[PDB]
């Protein structure tokens, strides 16, 4: 690896120098993923279509901004394709370790709620909201672009994505689900971000097959994923040949779900 | 045959050196090779002493204090890798200084705004009502340092009565800085200050009156150069150094490693 990847008047940067510079900082993290990818692809099938179906989901939402968001996260489409594939493999290994018995699903059903869609207005302090609180004296969407410091939603009347329980900020959501009918509005909520006002747009047999999807969703925790990978790692009988990389799997060799 | 050696063996097959190289390069190759390349070009032209790097290392280490190690790990750094980045950053600083106008007219003009370092204490709180409460306790005879330990959400300084390190102009939030230098005498306390972080009260500990330019010029020069080490100027300097280096990229995977500088 004495070959030059870059030449300068001051000398060359070689393959060797680039390899070792990268390895020192990123070697453990990358070799871990390469290792898991191999052992998992051996046991679990991911089809090119499965990767495509996942890919398109993301591709639709972002529209014009798709390619732009990849670059901002240091991704190409193909490198993104690879990451979706890796995530699916881990997802499969985690699901293989899930107990999806009727009793668990029936038990999960009582706590579960469907997704909720709202608008909101974000401001720095309660008095400004109080100005907004009295502001009706008129349209919620109009005052959102007028006052909301949430640049992601301000232009769009403060419209939020659909979201479920546990999945968004606790205080915000309590207030959201308390909403009753189309377009009626909350009191002032104080979150980590600031003070909010929230407006409802959409709320909704067991209708359970959705819950099955939701339960599996909720079980894709970092703990369960780590637990699943520990089992796979153990069954693979790995031997680390490069002693620089001996600590590459530290996050998977403790009684906890992480290193330190 | 090159890099065919296994770095890891598994029942499912081996991952080789080459595969690790190529995988790292895809994600981290551009950023790492950019730094290696600039370091080599800059090392050739500009002198950095170990004395400088150590002084910089100590600066940051004390500055972050207890939270030092935690912030390194969060940025995927060791002490060793961090020290290397400081050396690299200093090289970039040298190239930027070489691009600076440090003429007497610039310095004398900078002198007008410049001040010697100032030492203050402060109390940081979430809202104005809390600050007003503290202002009333101060009037009623409670101690500023006591109220810092009781109220201040600035964990870095709250235990020590809210004492901050000495700082000059430009180094802090502008609003904070104006309010601090506006204080006249030792133990004077500010009105409510509103920064990006929250609401402050500030107490003066030490202030020094600016001397003549002749007496202060070496201080003024150091501060001026420092104020010119902006992200804009450093970027400009690296563009200029890169163009002058006439580099030749051999690995087409890395063709865009310097996109921000061409």
UniProtKB/Swiss-Prot annotation, chain A:
It is found in: Cell membrane. Pfam families: Rotamase_3. InterPro entries: Foldase_PrsA, PPIase_dom_sf, PPIase_PpiC, PrsA_foldase, Trigger_fact/SurA_dom_sf. GO terms for molecular function: peptidyl-prolyl cis-trans isomerase activity. Keywords: Cell membrane, Isomerase, Lipoprotein, Membrane, Palmitate, Rotamase, Signal. PROSITE patterns: PPIC_PPIASE_2, PROKAR_LIPOPROTEIN. GO terms for biological process: protein folding. It is a lipid-anchor. This is Foldase protein PrsA 1. It catalyses: [protein]-peptidylproline (omega=180) = [protein]-peptidylproline (omega=0). Belongs to the PrsA family. Plays a major role in protein secretion by helping the post-translocational extracellular folding of several secreted proteins. Its main location: membrane. Residues 113-202 form the PpiC domain.
């Amino acid at each position: 690896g004495s070959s030059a990847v870059i030449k300068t008047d001051a000398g060359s940067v070689t393959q060797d120098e680039l390899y070792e510079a990268m390895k020192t900082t990123y070697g453990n993290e990358v070799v871990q993923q390469l290792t898991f990818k191999k052992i998992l692809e051996d046991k679990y099938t991911v089809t090119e279509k499965e990767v495509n179906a996942e890919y398109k989901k993301y591709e639709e939402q972002y529209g014009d901004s798709f390619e732009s968001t990849l670059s901002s996260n240091n991704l190409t489409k193909t490198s993104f394709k690879e990451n979706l594939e890796y995530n699916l493999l881990v997802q499969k290994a985690t699901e293989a370790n899930m107990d999806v018995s009727e009793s668990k699903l029936k038990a999960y059903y009582k706590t579960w709620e469907p997704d909720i869609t709202v608008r909101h207005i974000l401001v720095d302090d309660e008095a400004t909201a109080k100005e907004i609180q009295t502001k009706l004296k008129e349209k919620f969407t109009d005052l959102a672009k007028e006052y909301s410091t949430d640049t992601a939603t301000s232009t769009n009347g403060g419209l939020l994505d659909p979201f479920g329980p546990g999945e968004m900020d606790e205080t915000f959501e309590k207030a959201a689900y308390a909403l009753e009918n189309k377009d009626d509005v909350s009191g002032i909520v104080k979150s980590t971000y600031g003070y909010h006002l929230i407006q409802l747009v959409k709320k909704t047999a067991k209708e359970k097959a959705n819950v099955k999807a939701a339960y599996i969703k909720s079980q894709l925790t970092s703990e369960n994923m780590t637990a699943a990978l520990k089992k796979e790692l153990k069954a693979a009988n790995i031997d680390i040949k490069d002693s620089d990389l001996k600590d590459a799997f530290a996050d998977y060799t403790s009684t906890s779900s992480t290193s330190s």
